[PDB]
Design a protein around this ligand. Structure first.
Ligand code: NI
Ligand SMILES: [Zn+2]
Lengths: 141, 141
């Protein structure tokens, strides 16, 4: 199926009886215009967005009488880094920046992909972190 | 005069009546082992530290009956970036690290060299800053 435009937002279908076939994408895929990937049900999707438009989490790509195809990012292992002080947030984020590692910084936390080599740097900086799962919902960037 | 060992720490001399003759160095001179420069009073200093020694801010190189020669870095034009939230500290430090800009992060402040091209970036993150004159006191590792 070639997809040239986004046709809705998956939250708007909360009471719909239509079944969702999820197209699961990488964090990198957020805000792309061109993407080729297969859905959880095996439907081949070629996204070639005709607007200067770009993909977001929870966009609906296709609506039939009974089915919705909608985007979400994959559920993946993360570290939630929890600096306690401003100096801590600064040194940690600097070292992440310097490494060119993708992250999301919201309030007093830094979210990064699980990675054992980075875990060793988190320890040099000396910040507490917790390991968890998330679907990345915002583009980087 | 040849210096092959450091003889003290300038902060320990608070009570002293001796005059300090500062040897002013560049930020990049810290942790060097060899350097030759004149003091603010015109004394030629030839540092060649003996056994893997390295220079630090505040090192006393020479003490006479009336004088202390000590290292400090030059006063130079800086931005002092004054992030008001954890989120501000983390975003700003990430962006500095990502560009590989030398900085010192101490408590709630990021100190960088005066550099007009950075104002666009600081503005983009949205963080208060003031332009000022400071000495950089730690080597950039
Ligand atoms: Ni680089
Ligand atoms: Zn909606």
């Amino acid at each position: 199926m070639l997809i040239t435009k986004i046709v809705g937002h998956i939250d708007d279908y909360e009471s719909s009886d239509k079944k969702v076939d999820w197209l699961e994408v990488e964090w990198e895929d957020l805000n792309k215009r061109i993407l080729r990937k297969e859905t959880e049900n095996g439907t081949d999707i070629a996204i070639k967005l005709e607007n200067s438009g770009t993909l977001r989490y929870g966009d609906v790509l296709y609506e039939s009488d009974d089915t919705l195809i909608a985007i979400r990012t994959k559920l993946e292992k993360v570290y939630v880094i929890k600096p306690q002080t401003m100096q801590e947030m600064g040194k940690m984020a600097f070292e992440i920046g310097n490494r060119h590692t993708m992250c999301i910084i919201e309030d007093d936390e830094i979210l990064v992909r699980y990675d054992k080599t980075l875990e060793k740097l988190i320890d040099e900086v000396g910040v507490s972190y917790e390991q968890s799962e998330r679907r990345f919902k915002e583009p980087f960037k």
